[PDB]
Design a protein around this ligand. Structure first.
Ligand code: GDP
Ligand code: EZZ
Ligand code: EZZ
Ligand code: MG
Ligand code: MG
Length: 163
C-alpha cells in the first residue's frame, strides 16, 4: 500500500494533538500533554486507494522532521491571532529545509466550534491564496472538517508525486 508521511505543525495550544487523536482514535482529548511529540499510524482508504498514514504530532521545531515530512498541516486556532501570524514561521522554515516553494501543505483553522473568532475566513483565505494552498476549517471537538483537512493533505502529496 501507499505510504504518506504527514506533519502537524503550529503554535502550542492550537489543537495539533486533539486533531491527530480525533483522526486516529475518533475521540476528543480535552487535556493532552503539550510537550509530548509522537507519531501515529492509520490505514485508511482515500479515493479508493489503501493508504498508510504516518502522522507526526509535533510539540515545538527541527529541520529533520521537516526533511522527512511529505506533507504539512499548518494549524492555527480561529480564536488566536498570534497562532495565525505564527503560520508564516513554519511555512518559511519548511520552504528553507525542503529548498522548494511547492511543498504539499494545508492551512488549518482549528476550533471552528468556538464563537470567539479573531481570525476571519477572509484573512485565512487570503493567506492560503498567497501560499497557493487549500484552507480548511476544523473542530477537533465536533470532528467537523477533520477528515477533509487530513485527506486533502494526502491528495496534495499524491498530486505533488504525480506532478
Ligand atoms: N473548543 C475546542 N477546543 C479545542 C479544539 N482542539 C483543541 N482544543 C483544546 O485546546 C487545547 C489545546 O489542544 P492541544 O491538542 O493540546 O494543542 P497542541 O498544543 O497544538 O497539541 C486543549 O484544551 C484542547 O481540548 C477544538 O477544535 N475546539
Ligand atoms: C483506485 N484508484 C481510484 C486510486 C486513486 N484515487 C485517486 C484520486 C486522485 C488521484 C489519483 C488517484 C488514484 C490512483 N490513480 C493515479 O493516477 C494515482 C497516482 C498515485 C497514487 O498514489 C494513486 C493513484
Ligand atoms: C518513522 N515513523 C515511524 C515515525 C515518524 N513519522 C513521521 C511523519 C512525518 C515526519 C517525520 C516522521 C517520523 C520520524 N522521522 C523523523 O525524521 C522524525 C523526527 C522527529 C520525530 O519526532 C519523529 C520522526
Ligand atoms: Mg500537543
Ligand atoms: Mg483585529
Amino acid at each position: 500500500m501507499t505510504e504518506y508521511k504527514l506533519v502537524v505543525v503550529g503554535a502550542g495550544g492550537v489543537g495539533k494533538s486533539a486533531l491527530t487523536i480525533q483522526l486516529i482514535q475518533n475521540h476528543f482529548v480535552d487535556e493532552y500533554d503539550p510537550t509530548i511529540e509522537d507519531s501515529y499510524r492509520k490505514q485508511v482508504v482515500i479515493d479508493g486507494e489503501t493508504c498508510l498514514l504516518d502522522i507526526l504530532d509535533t510539540a515545538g521545531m527541527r529541520d529533520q522532521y521537516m526533511r522527512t515530512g511529505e506533507g504539512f498541516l499548518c494549524v492555527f486556532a480561529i480564536n488566536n491571532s498570534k497562532s495565525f501570524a505564527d503560520i508564516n514561521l513554519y511555512r518559511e522554515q519548511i520552504k528553507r529545509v525542503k529548498d522548494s516553494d511547492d511543498v504539499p501543505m494545508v492551512l488549518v483553522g482549528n476550533k471552528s466550534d468556538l464563537p470567539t473568532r479573531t481570525v476571519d475566513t477572509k484573512q485565512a483565505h487570503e493567506l492560503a491564496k498567497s501560499y497557493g494552498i487549500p484552507f480548511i476549517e476544523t473542530s477537533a471537538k465536533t470532528r467537523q472538517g477533520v477528515e477533509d483537512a487530513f485527506y486533502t493533505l494526502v491528495r496534495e502529496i499524491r498530486q505533488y508525486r504525480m506532478k
